């Protein structure tokens, strides 16, 4: 009843040939020249090495199969750039490649918000330092204590440890139902804006047609593009000083609405 993808794959790998030194050299020379069978046999025979490496960095982030596959990608690059002319063995060279590709993938895919390798490498140094501090300081590393030891900026160390903060699932207990939509306004707030927008239209046809024209076209109320000082001036043909004159007159008209219906504006003082 072998159903498991992992056990099936490991059964298939076991069924492979194990390579010797002379065999590795023969196949490797044919492989670099571009043999089909040679490349396939070298990869298939050295899958076992990937697994002994993929099962070594277990319980770190990525799953065995996931690391077994990314590790296999390193195997392929290893076979492509292997030097059979050098007397030194293949297993030694491949180990570098398999560990490199696995580590690179574990630094990228693991983190939901994709964290760049530059920051990840810096983070490594901060954490190793924290470990040595913890062994001697019975307490745990502070941000400032780590920063002192590396001779680096406190702010930089804090930014990095912040990026270490891992993600809280909303569906894991639900948190979704507590946390409200912040971008959506309550009908209370949306209705308040309707009242303001409606009042403005009526407020535009209450004062002068010369000032309302300026504010309507500039703010983009009845207009479309919020024309700045120069564009509003150029339209009505008015001057820069005239802009300040219409503005001051427009505020005086609003003061009249305020002393009449200011009962709402004076409440803006809390």
């Amino acid at each position: 009843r072998v159903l498991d993808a992992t056990q099936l794959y490991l059964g298939e790998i076991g069924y492979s040939p194990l390579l010797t030194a002379e065999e590795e050299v023969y196949f490797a020379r044919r492989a670099l020249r571009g043999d089909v069978a040679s490349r396939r046999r070298m990869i298939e025979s050295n899958l076992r090495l990937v697994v002994k490496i993929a099962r070594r960095y277990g319980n770190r982030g990525l799953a065995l199969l996931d690391l077994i596959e990314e590790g296999n990608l390193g195997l392929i690059r290893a076979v492509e750039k292997f030097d059979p002319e050098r007397g030194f063995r293949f297993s030694t060279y491949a180990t570098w490649w398999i560990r490199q590709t696995i580590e690179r993938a574990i630094m990228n895919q693991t983190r939901t918000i994709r964290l760049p390798i530059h920051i990840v490498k810096e983070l490594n140094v901060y954490l190793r330092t924290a470990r040595e501090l913890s062994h001697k300081l019975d307490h745990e590393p502070s941000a400032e204590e780590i920063a002192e030891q590396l001779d680096k900026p406190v702010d930089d160390v804090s930014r990095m440890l912040r990026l270490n903060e891992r993600i809280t699932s909303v569906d894991t207990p639900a948190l979704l139902d507590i946390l409200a939509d912040e971008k959506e306004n309550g009908p209370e707030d949306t209705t308040q804006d309707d009242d303001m927008k409606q009042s403005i239209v009526k407020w535009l046809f209450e004062l002068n047609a010369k000032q309302r024209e300026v504010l309507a076209r500039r703010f983009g109320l009845l207009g479309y593009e919020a024309a700045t000082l120069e564009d509003v001036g150029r339209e009505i043909g008015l001057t820069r000083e005239r802009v300040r004159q219409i503005q001051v007159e427009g505020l005086r008209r609003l003061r009249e609405i305020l002393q009449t219906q200011g009962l709402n504006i004076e409440a803006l003082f809390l």
Binding site: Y9, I43, N72, T112, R114, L115, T168, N264
Partner: protein, 1362 residues
């Protein structure tokens, strides 16, 4: 948008592409630094839309001016952010991927389609083994699995001209190549030639699948996914918590799994990787997609961060918690609040105290509105700040808004509709809601911290529906049974009891008053007790033949108190109503009487008045609870020492040899159960009266005014059962198993328990409390199954004009009539011109309403049997007629068309169960059962009537019964049935058939413990097959040596004896077999499990003797725990484990073949020449003998009847009446009144579907299951036009299946089994036109019932044109 229906069908790869707005290539979510969406990632703005309203990502276009302006630089459309909740994406899969739902979901569609077992397909999918897709060379045919080595062999030899592949590509190719048409014809050809019984079903099911597949226009290839859709971002959001951290949906982790492995597969294909590694990646890709769709179905679910399995797509739809039950069939609501409830005795029935601050908040928009119309507020934000400041003018405005505005009060749990009621609110200072006492019954509200939800009906329509339909005043009667739910209790009962009840002389015995006012003045003046006997002059107002009220003045001999209560009593009612000492039982009748004579508003006022006076006099009285109020009988210790030496003597006789554990258990329980009753009756004589009061001269006896006795007798609170435990004996307590402890508690609570009695008490107590927590769930689950089944049922028509009905007899079980025929046919439309006995004139019409007046006439004539119109026999298609139903029991008049009857039925069946679960359990400790069903003693003189009985005369002179179903009845003179009495098997009758007995005579005695095996014939006894150790067991005694035989059943029995039936066989002196009088049957009595025979083989028996005692341990306690499963078994239409056999066709029968002992009963009817032959077990013994002319459904075997067999042979009214009576048996045992018409609704919903034989003008053919209404519609047009006539047969569906068989898949999905429902609907291409209630509630539309029935019927006629 406004739409007609919804359809579901398989998604084509290209269909999936249509919804998509781009392919998400990368797992990248957002940028760690600028927290904005990455390139072509999972939150890509280029695909799903802009993060901010009308703004591109790189920020070049802003403001509402830019509309649909796709920014050239970043590639982001300037529209609203809302779009990111609606736009979908997609994923290009390298390898085809099977959709788990069509693979794993049973039965499965891919397997059933290919006729290929799941195992085979899986070996193919996980790349263990190859499958042949097609070989022109028959060498290898189709769908034949080859292992890795099997593929190498044929590949050299044949190769090329045979195509075999591995993985989902193989299965997709196999699906693409398969021709639905041709296989349909091939399978039809197979069924024509050789239709084997069981494989005809499976072949017909694949035929239905193939037909349905082609009609749906679904393609089998699409079961395998090439394109994978991506859910819009906002429906799987990544949001920042306050802490700076982020929180995301698990769907993001599952999508990232799928994309990583898919892209890695693309890579390994570009790199030409060796095939072992390609395979691993294809397995991992299918694993990731299957986890994303439905995680946990494909084996071990993928655990995320905690260890908890990631929540997948299907998990958000499926569970109760999915989206159906949580967000759609119920929601969180605006203008809602809650608080603790507290009494408002000052309130009138239509009012409730609503806290100031609570109401301020709930009616915020209504305040804003009035504030602006008065011009007190310039605008909304100023109005808000005036409310924030809580200004004095705002209170006055709020008072003005709340006036005549109804508010909904709700209490959990909402079991029945009265769990929501509307009230007019009364603004109160303080934080607690004030509830009217009289409605506390409907809510089951007690003020020890319960809370209530408040809801504000906003619209004019909602206000009107609250005031008219949902108002407290208007919902007085229970919709479950006709009775008033609005009933005084506790203080109110006690006060009116105190006022009405009379005392000897007291102050001012035998005075005379002018009316109740002089009486009130006398009492309050302090010259008269409320219990003084006196003759007052009250003037009652009796209604005449018309609407005018007649006035009558006469002198009455009552008491001061009753006279003053007359002042509350409305005109129309008799003074005799108040002239008795009033209890809660009498006050309920008072309010019902007042409702039916005077009407609603008067009863409303009268109810409030009763409550006010009841509290008021309760408080005046000053009734309370001292320890001396709990009176112990002087003669307890005697009764107990007697009982105790007696039980001691039976325990000593136990070591001797006359006793099993079951026998002595029964005997000790009987002794203590009788002792408990004795001590209780001693306490109640000593307490109830034992009032020595000297009347005006000498001594008298009258009823005691002891406080606790008054509380019990009035029905104010505790019952006689509770007061037994207080003042008498606590009694036998029952273990959590239900089995009763052998040592009872002798002491009571006044006496105090000792450590051992208290510890023993705990068992029963805690089992009770655990029962409320755990059993409530099954009660509630039954409510929900009932609701789902009877959601659609609505009053559609006024009169279908049907004559058909179900003959309802008076339930006369256990001497005293349990439920009268009058009450069972009250409020029900009659039929078949039911007149009086003497057939020469009609008494009642064929279409009328049975009012209390018609019912009272029925009683003078003593009508026993009445055909009434019922819901089950109603002809209305897609609902039921107002006449077939009858009165809306909650309204007290004929039901309104449009009322949702089914819901009311389900709620009203469900409520009592759910309420009686918590209720009897926390409230009781011990079990006060009474098992002493030995002797029938008859209460009234008459003649013995024995229907269904076959008994043999024993050597005693006595009639020893040997029938299973035996009904002793008590006939009077005229010849009516008045008392019934279920005689058992093994009974000794005092007198035989049709003999006179006097009042209080014993007519039959039987042992309750032990059902004896009683032999008909006389002779010697032979042991057949009774090998010791094999089938029986041997147990020996001392000095001489009495052995006793116990029949070990197949449970304890060895493999050797399995096939042997052990039986006591009757032979004569010669040692030949004695025959059973007049048949060819030799006497032989088959002994069941543990049949304890005393008398060893070769003993001369006489006839009518006890051979064998099978022990009958009744460990059952009288609660709903045992009862509700019976109810649920009935509603779910379960065949019992031993069904009793019925004759299928009328006609004359002889025996044919026998398999050793197994009977092959051969029926050969008279007219119908075809025989009907049945295989029957050997040990199952027949009631019928040989050649009798038996009709359809005559009982052949001993055993319970299957509702299926009843329906199938006798018919609708038979099976409906079987269910109604068998369910009602349980509820009646717990004192629960539910009207039959509710049960009848649900049975109608059970009998929804029907199987069809032959064809009509439509597509019926053999054995399609279609709904009864739709086949009747066809039959109506067929009979007028002609065409092929179609025989039909109604099928019973039990609740769960009946709800899933509904031709709405939105209702089926919302109920249960959502994954399976949606696969079957998707494959059928099913279209839901939304006729039902659940369907409309889900889409948030007007219900097709109540208010909505008007609007909904207007839409249905808008379908005819425009």
């Amino acid at each position: 948008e406004e739409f007609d229906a919804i359809k579901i069908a398989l998604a084509s790869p290209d269909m999936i592409r249509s919804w998509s707005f781009g392919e998400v290539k990368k797992p990248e979510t957002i940028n760690y630094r600028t927290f904005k969406p990455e390139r072509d990632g999972l939150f890509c703005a280029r695909i799903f839309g802009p993060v901010k309203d009308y703004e591109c990502l790189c920020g070049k276009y802003k403001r509402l001016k830019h509309r649909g302006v796709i920014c050239e630089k970043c590639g982001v459309e300037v529209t609203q952010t809302k779009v990111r909740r609606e736009r979908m994406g997609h994923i290009e899969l390298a390898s085809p991927t099977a959709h788990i739902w069509f693979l794993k979901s049973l039965p499965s569609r891919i397997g059933l389609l290919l006729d290929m077992p799941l195992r085979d397909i899986e070996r193919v999918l996980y790349f263990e083994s190859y499958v042949v897709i097609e070989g022109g060379m028959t060498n290898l045919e189709r769908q034949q699995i080859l292992t890795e080595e099997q593929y190498l062999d044929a590949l050299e030899e044949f190769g090329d001209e045979f195509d075999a592949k591995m993985g989902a590509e193989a299965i997709q190719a196999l699906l693409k190549s398969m021709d639905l048409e041709q296989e349909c014809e091939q399978l039809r050809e197979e069924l024509n030639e050789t239709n084997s019984e069981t494989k005809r079903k499976k072949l017909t099911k694949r035929i239905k699948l193939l037909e349905a597949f082609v009609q749906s226009g679904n393609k089998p290839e699409w079961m395998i996914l090439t394109v994978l859709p991506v859910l819009p971002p906002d429906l799987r959001p990544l949001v920042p918590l306050d802490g700076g951290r982020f929180a995301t949906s698990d769907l993001n982790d599952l999508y990232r799994r799928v994309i990583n492995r898919n892209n890695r597969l693309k890579r390994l294909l570009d790199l030409a990787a060796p095939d072992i590694i390609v395979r691993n990646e294809k397995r991992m890709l299918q694993e990731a997609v299957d986890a994303l769709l439905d995680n946990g179905r494909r084996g071990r679910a993928i655990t995320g961060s905690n260890k908890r399995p990631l929540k997948s797509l299907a998990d958000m739809i499926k569970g109760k918690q999915g989206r159906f039950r949580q967000n759609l069939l119920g929601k969180r609501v605006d203008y809602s609040g809650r608080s603790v409830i507290t009494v408002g005795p000052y309130l009138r029935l239509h009012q409730c105290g609503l806290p100031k601050k609570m109401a301020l908040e709930l009616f915020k928009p209504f305040i804003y509105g009035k504030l602006e119309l008065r011009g007190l507020a310039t605008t909304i934000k100023a109005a808000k700040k005036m409310v924030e400041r809580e200004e004095a003018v705002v209170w006055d405005i709020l008072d003005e808004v709340i006036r005549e505005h109804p508010v909904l009060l709700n209490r959990a749990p909402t079991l029945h509709r009265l769990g929501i009621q509307a009230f007019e609110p009364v603004l109160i200072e303080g934080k607690a809601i004030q509830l009217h006492p009289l409605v506390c019954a409907a809510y089951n509200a007690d003020f020890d911290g319960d809370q209530m939800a408040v809801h504000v009906p906003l619209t004019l329509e909602a206000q009107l529906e609250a005031r008219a339909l949902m108002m407290s005043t208007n919902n007085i009667l229970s919709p479950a049974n006709g009775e008033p739910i609005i009933v005084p209790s506790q203080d109110v009962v006690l006060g009116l009891y105190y006022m009405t009840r009379d005392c000897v002389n007291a102050k001012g015995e035998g005075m005379v008053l002018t009316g109740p006012k002089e009486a009130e003045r006398l009492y309050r003046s302090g010259l008269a007790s409320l219990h003084a006997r006196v003759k007052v002059r009250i003037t009652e107002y009796e209604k005449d033949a018309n609407g005018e009220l007649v006035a009558k003045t006469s002198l009455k001999d009552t008491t001061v108190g009753r006279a003053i209560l007359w002042m509350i009593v409305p005109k129309g009612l008799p003074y005799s109503i108040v002239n008795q000492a009033l209890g809660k039982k009498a006050i309920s009748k008072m309010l019902n009487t007042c409702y039916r004579i005077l009407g609603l508003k008067p009863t409303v006022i009268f109810a409030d008045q009763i409550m006010y006076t009841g509290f008021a006099y309760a408080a005046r009285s000053g009734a309370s609870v001292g320890i001396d109020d709990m009176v112990i009988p002087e003669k307890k210790h005697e009764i107990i020492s007697e009982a105790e030496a007696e039980v001691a003597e039976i325990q000593e006789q136990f070591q001797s040899g006359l006793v099993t554990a079951g026998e002595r258990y029964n005997k000790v329980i009987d002794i203590w159960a009788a002792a408990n009753d004795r001590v209780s009756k001693a306490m109640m004589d000593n307490l109830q009266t034992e009032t020595v009061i000297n009347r005006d001269g000498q001594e008298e006896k009258q009823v005691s005014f002891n406080s606790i006795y008054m509380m019990a007798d009035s029905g104010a609170r505790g019952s006689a059962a509770q007061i037994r435990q207080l003042a008498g004996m606590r009694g036998l307590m029952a273990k959590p198993d239900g089995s009763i402890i052998e040592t009872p508690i002798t002491a009571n609570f006044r006496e105090g328990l000792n450590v051992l009695q208290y510890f023993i008490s705990t068992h029963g107590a805690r089992k009770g409390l655990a029962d409320t927590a755990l059993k409530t769930a099954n009660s509630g689950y039954l409510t929900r199954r009932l609701v789902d089944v009877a959601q659609d049922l609505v009053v559609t028509e006024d009169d279908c004009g049907t004559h058909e009905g179900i003959m309802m007899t008076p339930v006369i079980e256990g001497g005293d009539v349990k439920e009268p025929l009058r009450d069972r046919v009250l409020g029900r439309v009659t039929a078949e011109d039911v007149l009086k006995p003497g057939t020469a004139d009609i008494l009642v019409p064929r279409n009328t309403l049975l009012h209390e007046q018609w019912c009272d006439l029925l009683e003078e004539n003593s009508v026993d049997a009445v055909k009434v119109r019922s819901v089950v026999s109603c002809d209305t298609d897609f609902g039921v007629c107002a006449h077939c139903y009858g009165r809306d029991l909650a309204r007290g008049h004929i039901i309104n068309k449009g009322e949702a009857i089914g819901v009311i039925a389900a709620q009203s069946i469900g409520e009592p169960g759910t309420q009686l679960t918590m209720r009897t359990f926390h409230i009781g400790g011990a079990a006060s059962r009474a098992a002493a069903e030995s002797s029938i003693q008859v209460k009234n003189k008459g003649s013995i009537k024995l229907s269904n009985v076959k008994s043999v005369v024993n050597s005693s002179g006595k009639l020893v019964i040997t029938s299973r179903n035996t009904e002793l009845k008590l006939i009077d003179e005229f010849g009516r049935t008045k008392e019934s009495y279920k005689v058992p098997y093994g009974a000794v009758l005092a007198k035989g058939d049709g003999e006179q007995v006097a009042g209080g005579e014993t007519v039959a005695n039987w042992d309750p413990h032990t059902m004896p095996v009683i032999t008909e014939v006389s002779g010697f006894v032979r042991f057949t097959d009774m090998i010791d150790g094999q089938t029986i067991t041997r147990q020996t005694d001392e000095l001489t040596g009495l052995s006793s035989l116990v029949v070990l059943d197949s449970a304890e029995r060895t493999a050797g004896g399995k096939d042997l039936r052990p039986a006591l066989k009757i032979v004569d002196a010669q040692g030949n077999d004695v025959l059973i009088p007049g048949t060819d049957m030799p006497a032989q009595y088959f002994l069941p499990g543990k049949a304890i025979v005393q008398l060893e083989d070769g003993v001369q028996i006489s006839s009518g003797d006890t051979l064998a005692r099978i022990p009958q341990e009744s460990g059952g306690t009288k609660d709903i725990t045992g009862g509700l499963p019976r109810v649920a078994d009935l509603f779910e239409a379960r065949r019992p484990k031993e069904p009793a056999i019925l004759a299928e066709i009328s006609g004359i029968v002889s025996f044919g073949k026998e398999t050793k002992g197994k009977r092959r009963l051969v029926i050969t009817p008279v007219d119908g020449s075809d025989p009907y032959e049945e295989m029957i077990p050997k040990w199952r013994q027949l009631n019928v003998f040989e050649g009798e002319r038996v009709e359809r459904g005559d009982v052949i075997s001993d055993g319970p009847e299957a509702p299926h067999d009843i329906l199938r042979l006798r018919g609708v009214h038979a099976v409906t009446r079987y269910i109604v009576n068998e369910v009602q048996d349980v509820y009646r045992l717990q004192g629960v009144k539910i009207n039959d018409k509710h049960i009848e609704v649900i049975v109608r919903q059970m009998l929804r579907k029907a199987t069809i034989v032959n064809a009509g003008s439509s597509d019926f053919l053999e054995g399609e299951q279609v709904e009864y209404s739709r086949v009747k519609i066809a039959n109506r047009e067929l009979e007028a036009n002609g065409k092929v006539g179609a025989t039909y047969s109604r099928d019973l569906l039990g609740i769960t299946k009946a709800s899933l068989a509904t031709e709405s898949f939105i209702s089926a999905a919302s109920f249960q089994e959502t994954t399976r429902v949606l696969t079957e609907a998707a494959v059928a291409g099913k279209r839901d036109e939304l006729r039902g209630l659940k369907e409309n509630v889900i889409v948030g539309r007007l219900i097709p019932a109540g208010t909505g029935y008007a609007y909904h019927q207007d839409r249905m006629r808008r379908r005819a044109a425009g």
